Design a protein around this ligand. Structure first.
Ligand SMILES: CS(=O)(=O)Nc1ccc(C(=O)NCc2ccc(Cl)cc2Cl)cc1
Ligand SMILES: CS(=O)(=O)Nc1ccc(C(=O)NCc2ccc(Cl)cc2Cl)cc1
Ligand SMILES: CCCCCCCCCCCCCCCC
Ligand SMILES: CCCCCCCCCC
Ligand SMILES: CCCCCCCCCC
Ligand SMILES: CCCCCCCCCC
Ligand SMILES: CCCCCCCC
Ligand SMILES: CCCCCCCC
Ligand SMILES: [K+]
Ligand SMILES: [K+]
Ligand SMILES: [K+]
Ligand SMILES: [K+]
Ligand SMILES: [K+]
Lengths: 281, 276
């Protein structure tokens, strides 16, 4: 029965779909709860700064001020810092920042602090992506395998010495804790400590950047290297290598959580089973 | 030899690594080629707009202008952005990992909630998107059951018709998932021809720069539009996941061919050299 299993699939997909829809509603409501306050409190305190310099210089047209701000905002997206005290500046598409940008594309982090304006760039980026993404996948699978058997040598020693009197399936719980623990050391903690001390970011700002970068949501609200500071150039290529491996590690993490959410479904599936079964005597 | 196979692994990974590294250098050089010009040409034509606004409105001092720019820069860090709908959008950007980032959490809590929202939401979404991939997958399977009987009872027959089935995937696919939505984005947002195709590939590859975001301007939006784009993403993502996988498998073959092509090149060479 080829279509009997497919009916059992749609009943699965539709149920999940509604879980996601609900999860989007939960997230939505929590975010507009978290962010509506700081929005209106910065919105109300920006029209203080507007009407302070609306009435301080009426000799400028006053309708043109909002035009001017839109002219500055539009040029900000090309990467400007327009100032009287500073008119000579770095490039956003230098030898290195374009190489960064290839990175943002093939990883699909896509920070977007750098985005192509040139019609050609867009078209080259389309084609650069569609081939580069699947390409990178192989590197990242390879680095996942390489890291995968690396940690396999770590547990071969640990699953023999901790073989005292009394199990197989229970030491599977202890191996996974040491993954997540030692993992979140080199790939979340240690790089966050370095970003904090190098970029100058907060404690959370650096952890947040790490999860945003290595999940590959990559907002761009934080980008490591993106200010003009100094940069030791021991720094820049370490972060490349961090991403390369960090991505691989998170791909496992997110898969692990994926498989956790398999079980927790099967458990709540069976837990609804027993809840329906007893049903008030 | 447990380490003889592992040396054959690292020789694979390292060779790929250098392909990617080289590919990054190729892309880099092409982008700085494409984009260095438009950078300096917009940089030089923005200090025209600066020094025009001293001369066209001397009312403003040179000193208050740098205050003004700092007032704009400070407001850039804020960006309603977090209404009923735009936060729901933002959950979408997170669990899909498109992450347009036109909306990003400023609140310490938002960041922490977003970390946790992502780590659980991403794997969750994966299942929906796998389900929609399966559903779409057997949908197109019914499309080729009809097409692999009418064209396989006459001319140039099978395993080469595997080439013709995959062209009709990519063709009919790029119709509902690249063309048709790009046509609608062009006419709704007001974007160019390329701008809409570019947004599509950027959104559905999930690079999601954010330089284009469908819904992200303050245009009047029909209550038909917003939830169509959701549904577009939901399916569009699935379709591209296949596409990018297909290209992935293409790059398997081309490697195996150049692997074997180096094999024969070394083989005739090394035996030519050896006779001496
Ligand atoms: C605004 S800027 O572009 O002009 N400044 C720079 C910004 C970032 C980098 C860089 O390479 N950072 C490490 C890195 C590597 C690969 C990937 Cl994929 C992502 C990241 Cl974050 C360099 C210059
Ligand atoms: C600058 S703004 O945020 O305040 N304005 C808006 C921006 C976007 C939307 C919206 O609903 N887009 C549809 C959508 C949904 C989910 C995903 Cl993953 C991608 C997309 Cl394109 C609405 C308002
Ligand atoms: C200061 C750093 C904040 C990070 C706090 C850790 C959050 C990680 C939670 C992992 C997801 C499990 C949520 C459990 C809800 C039942
Ligand atoms: C964050 C909560 C999302 C899932 C709802 C739980 C009920 C399970 C339905 C069987
Ligand atoms: C309108 C520009 C489209 C170009 C990219 C489409 C794929 C063809 C590249 C070989
Ligand atoms: C060792 C694998 C060589 C891979 C070559 C990739 C070809 C891309 C050409 C567009
Ligand atoms: C817009 C033209 C790009 C051509 C790329 C070819 C580089 C080998
Ligand atoms: C972009 C072309 C890469 C060619 C390298 C092939 C080495 C086997
Ligand atoms: K992204
Ligand atoms: K992004
Ligand atoms: K992504
Ligand atoms: K992906
Ligand atoms: K982005």
């Amino acid at each position: 029965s080829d279509s009997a299993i497919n009916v059992m699939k749609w009943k699965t997909v539709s149920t999940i779909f509604l879980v996601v829809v609900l999860y989007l509603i939960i997230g939505a409501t929590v975010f507009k709860a978290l962010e509506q306050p700081q929005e209106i409190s910065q919105r109300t305190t920006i029209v203080i700064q507007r009407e302070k310099f609306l009435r301080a210089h009426p000799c400028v047209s006053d309708q043109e001020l909002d035009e001017l701000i839109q002219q500055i905002v539009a040029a900000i997206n090309a990467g400007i810092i327009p100032l009287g005290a500073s008119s000579n500046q770095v490039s956003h598409w230098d030898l290195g920042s374009s190489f960064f940008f290839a990175g943002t594309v093939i990883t699909t982090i896509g920070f977007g602090n750098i985005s192509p304006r040139t019609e050609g760039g867009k078209i080259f980026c389309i084609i650069y992506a569609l081939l580069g993404i699947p390409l990178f996948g192989f590197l990242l699978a390879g680095v996942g395998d390489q890291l995968g058997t690396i940690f396999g040598k770590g547990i071969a020693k640990v699953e023999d010495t901790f073989i005292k009197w009394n199990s197989q399936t229970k030491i599977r719980i202890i191996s996974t804790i040491i993954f997540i623990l030692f993992g979140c050391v080199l790939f979340v903690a240690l790089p966050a400590v370095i970003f904090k001390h190098i970029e100058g970011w907060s404690a959370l700002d650096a952890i947040y950047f790490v999860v945003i970068t290595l999940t590959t949501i990559g907002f761009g609200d934080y980008v490591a290297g993106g200010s003009d500071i100094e940069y030791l150039d021991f720094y820049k290529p370490v972060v490349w290598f961090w991403i390369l491996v960090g991505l691989a590690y998170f791909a496992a993490v997110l898969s692990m959580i994926g498989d956790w959410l398999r079980v927790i479904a099967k458990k709540t599936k069976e837990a609804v089973g027993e809840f329906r079964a007893h049903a008030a005597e």
